[PDB]
Amino acid sequence: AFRVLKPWWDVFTDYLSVAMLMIGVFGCTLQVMQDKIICLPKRVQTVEMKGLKTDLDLQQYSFINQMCYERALHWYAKYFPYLVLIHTLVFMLCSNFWFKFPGSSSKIEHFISILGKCFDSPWTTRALSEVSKKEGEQAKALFEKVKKFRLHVEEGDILYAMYVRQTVLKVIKFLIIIAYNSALVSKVQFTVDCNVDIQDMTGYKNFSCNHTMAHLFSKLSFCYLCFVSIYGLTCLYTLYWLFYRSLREYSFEYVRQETGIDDIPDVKNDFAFMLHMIDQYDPLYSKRFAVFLSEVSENKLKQLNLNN
Amino acid sequence: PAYRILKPWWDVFTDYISIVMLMIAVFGGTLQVTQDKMICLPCKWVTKDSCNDSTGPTGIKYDLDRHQYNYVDAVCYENRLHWFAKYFPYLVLLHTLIFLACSNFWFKFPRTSSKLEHFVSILLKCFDSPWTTRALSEGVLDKKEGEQAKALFEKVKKFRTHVEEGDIVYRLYMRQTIIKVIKFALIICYTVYYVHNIKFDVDCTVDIESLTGYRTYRCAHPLATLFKILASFYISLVIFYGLICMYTLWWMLRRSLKKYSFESIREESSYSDIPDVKNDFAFMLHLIDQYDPLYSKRFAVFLSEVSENKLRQLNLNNEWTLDK
Amino acid sequence: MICLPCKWVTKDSCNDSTGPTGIKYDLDRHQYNYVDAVCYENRLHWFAKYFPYLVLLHTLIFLACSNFWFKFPRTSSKLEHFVSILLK
Amino acid sequence: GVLDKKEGEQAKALFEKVKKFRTHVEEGDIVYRLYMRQTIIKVIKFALIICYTVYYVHNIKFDVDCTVDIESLTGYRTYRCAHP
Amino acid sequence: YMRQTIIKVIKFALIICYTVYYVHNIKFDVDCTVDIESLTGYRTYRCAHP
Ligand SMILES: CCCCCCCC/C=C\CCCCCCCC(=O)OC[C@H](COP(=O)(O)OCCN)OC(=O)CCCCCCC/C=C/CCCCCCCC
Numbered sequence: 001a002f003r004v005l006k007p008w009w010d011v012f013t014d015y016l017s018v019a020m021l022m023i024g025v026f027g028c029t030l031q032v033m034q035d036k037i038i039c040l041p042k043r044v045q046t047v048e049m050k051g052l053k054t055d056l057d058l059q060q061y062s063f064i065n066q067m068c069y070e071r072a073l074h075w076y077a078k079y080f081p082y083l084v085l086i087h088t089l090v091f092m093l094c095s096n097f098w099f100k101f102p103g104s105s106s107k108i109e110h111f112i113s114i115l116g117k118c119f120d121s122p123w124t125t126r127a128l129s130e131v132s133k134k135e136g137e138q139a140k141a142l143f144e145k146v147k148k149f150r151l152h153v154e155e156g157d158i159l160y161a162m163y164v165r166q167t168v169l170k171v172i173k174f175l176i177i178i179a180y181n182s183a184l185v186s187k188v189q190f191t192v193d194c195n196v197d198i199q200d201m202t203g204y205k206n207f208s209c210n211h212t213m214a215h216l217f218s219k220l221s222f223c224y225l226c227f228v229s230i231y232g233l234t235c236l237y238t239l240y241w242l243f244y245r246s247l248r249e250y251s252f253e254y255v256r257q258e259t260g261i262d263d264i265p266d267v268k269n270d271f272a273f274m275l276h277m278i279d280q281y282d283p284l285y286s287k288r289f290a291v292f293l294s295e296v297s298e299n300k301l302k303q304l305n306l307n308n
Numbered sequence: 309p310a311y312r313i314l315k316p317w318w319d320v321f322t323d324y325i326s327i328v329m330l331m332i333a334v335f336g337g338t339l340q341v342t343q344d345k346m347i348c349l350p351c352k353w354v355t356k357d358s359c360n361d362s363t364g365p366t367g368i369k370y371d372l373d374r375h376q377y378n379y380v381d382a383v384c385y386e387n388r389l390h391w392f393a394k395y396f397p398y399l400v401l402l403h404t405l406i407f408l409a410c411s412n413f414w415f416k417f418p419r420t421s422s423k424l425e426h427f428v429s430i431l432l433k434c435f436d437s438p439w440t441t442r443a444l445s446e447g448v449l450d451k452k453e454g455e456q457a458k459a460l461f462e463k464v465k466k467f468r469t470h471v472e473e474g475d476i477v478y479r480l481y482m483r484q485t486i487i488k489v490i491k492f493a494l495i496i497c498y499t500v501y502y503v504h505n506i507k508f509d510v511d512c513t514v515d516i517e518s519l520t521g522y523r524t525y526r527c528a529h530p531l532a533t534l535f536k537i538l539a540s541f542y543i544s545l546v547i548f549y550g551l552i553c554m555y556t557l558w559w560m561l562r563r564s565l566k567k568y569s570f571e572s573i574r575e576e577s578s579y580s581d582i583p584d585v586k587n588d589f590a591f592m593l594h595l596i597d598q599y600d601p602l603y604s605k606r607f608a609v610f611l612s613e614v615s616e617n618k619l620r621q622l623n624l625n626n627e628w629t630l631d632k
Numbered sequence: 633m634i635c636l637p638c639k640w641v642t643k644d645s646c647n648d649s650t651g652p653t654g655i656k657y658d659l660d661r662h663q664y665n666y667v668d669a670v671c672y673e674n675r676l677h678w679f680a681k682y683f684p685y686l687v688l689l690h691t692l693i694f695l696a697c698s699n700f701w702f703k704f705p706r707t708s709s710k711l712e713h714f715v716s717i718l719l720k
Numbered sequence: 721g722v723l724d725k726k727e728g729e730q731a732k733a734l735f736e737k738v739k740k741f742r743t744h745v746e747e748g749d750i751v752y753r754l755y756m757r758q759t760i761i762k763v764i765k766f767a768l769i770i771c772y773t774v775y776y777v778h779n780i781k782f783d784v785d786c787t788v789d790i791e792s793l794t795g796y797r798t799y800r801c802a803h804p
Numbered sequence: 805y806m807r808q809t810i811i812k813v814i815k816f817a818l819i820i821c822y823t824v825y826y827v828h829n830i831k832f833d834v835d836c837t838v839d840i841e842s843l844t845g846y847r848t849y850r851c852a853h854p
Contacts (some may be wrong), residue, residue: 034584038517046353046360051371051521061375066854210409347666349793367658367795377662445736529667600709637796641754671786671801677779697762701754719742
């Protein structure tokens, strides 16, 4: 269960990605509709009004429709949902990239596993009561496991760099999406002026067309812009939390003040970053883990077991 | 999972109303995407951009092609159909999504979700503990049941030290309830004020004379009365979703939910040392009482130091038997 | 609805009065569609238009009534309690 | 007779659980009242449904004579619609 | 496993060859001279493949 390492920003971005995927699917389903553009020629040949006889068949009208759809309608208004689909697929793929790496997942599972072993161990509350038979043996075994974890994960820094990389990729993708979508959202217009040269096939050269779902695609584009804006603000806060304080080091000095143990050291690198992650999840876990990190506390446990 | 005990009757009712409103949104959206149109006929005789409305009967000849009719329909659907009659299902879908997010925000927000999961897990394991039956019955004890009861007692102490200092769950539930009534008021106002604009007869004046030959057209919006029905039904459901939510606000403000007293339990049961709890512990026990008060009773024995002493004494009788 | 106009009328009522030839109404397809829409909205009975929706509403209320005590927490907790103890 | 110890304590604990469940439930009759109300609602709803549905079933006719006064738009006043 | 990989790469090569060669034949404007003059009155037509 990796949910303990998913902060509020990650969950929020995942739900925004789901919403954007829904928007893209709905837009594609709207694009499925056959009747897309409706074109009438220009300068066609109490008051009683009479209709203008354009003198065109239904097939001529359909030919004009497809010609003006291909050669007069902007490509954004025709391929916006597919771009949304591609962008949301990229967002979903690059939002789990820290989680689904081979070497990173094992470290994550090891950290959360021994941290849960802490959060369920009697020796943690026993150690707080010490500060303030079988369980002792399990305590000693878990303490050897904690030392094994220290020698096993603390060396590397793949997790922090990988998370920074995926956050930066999210930020730059958000910037590109916002820029180009805000630039091209003005091209989703209802009334279009089509000037294809099919005078030899139909008889007319200038047509006025209406894109029937241009209003719907404009609303979808604005909603997608709002969703991407929220996603990018969330990713910018993620970057700010990543770089406003050094996440490559974690100080246990708060536990040093709270817990009477001062042998508790300040771990670094991936240990530090995952401690910050679980602090975003639940700050009690790190405080309870600290009493297992220190080795003078291990000597005290050894003495207690020796006397017992 | 087992979060059904954390959802009182009002939350279940609001969830089901949200499901029905989502059904309304999907149905209306499918209809608006597939069959929503206007059937516009030009007004032959016009009187200052208004229809004049004037041997056997013979049909009026408008001389329009089918595509001119389609163009007129599209233009008078975009420019003269009211925005409510066009974007009602999407507004309903947005409102339902916000309502569902507000109702299920604290189940996804990590700080509150961790506390809720901890509470539900310890309460389920406490309610299913045989030590609860033994203590409320007031030496035979299974060994594994012995250290199970001891470890669960220690876990209850752990949880009380871990949750009782904070009130994030209560504040989040308050804010969710406040948003779910503010949005209900706004929805009811803007939906009742604009439902009358969903009409079947729409008179459009769009100035496409250079392409069609007529200025003013009379249009029929076929899926309007149905949209007048669904909206009305929606205005019904939201009203219910309001009233229920308002009751929740009353339930959260008639008394202080950040203080829970076990006075009845220590009145009935023998263990009178059971203390009073505060903050998120109190609010979550109130939520549990909204489902089944007995779940509180079997929890209370795990909050008492007299029960701890009795459990310690009986366990000490058990493992240190007379033969060894 | 598929509405054809009555050529012969008598006070807003259809009068109903060598080779046969078709009756020419001089109506466009869109005039026919407008006539269908207006007579469907105004002259088709509301039951013939909203029978399935009323049936759906009635079934939803029937199923809510049948499964209310399984969902209402006060009764659902007691029912789960009784089912558990009786099955054990 | 013979009695596995787990079976014996489970039997005694389930006896005490029967007593506790009894004193928990026997005081109230909420389930019976709710079932009563559900059956009453389901029978009065059946009465209303059969009434208004038998009364209005004759209105589902294939041929409907419509008179809508759109003569200024169509040229005809009365039409004979077919409802497939 | 070796045979599966070899088939998956040789079919990849054939797919790329025939798909890249014929991808330019998906055109919007297509002239058709189908000789149905006895049924339509015209021999040549200018279709648009949407
Ligand atoms: C592996 C092989 C897969 C192929 C299997 C095909 C499955 C379906 C085949 C049967 C289709 C039945 C219809 C055939 C005749 C078409 C009839 C027709 O022209 O109807 C029109 C109608 C379009 O309406 P317009 O007139 O434009 O409406 C405008 C006013 N709103 O055409 C249709 O779309 C046919 C409707 C049948 C639905 C079948 C599925 C349609 C395609 C759904 C695609 C949705 C995918 C969205 C996700 C994409 C991105 C992830």
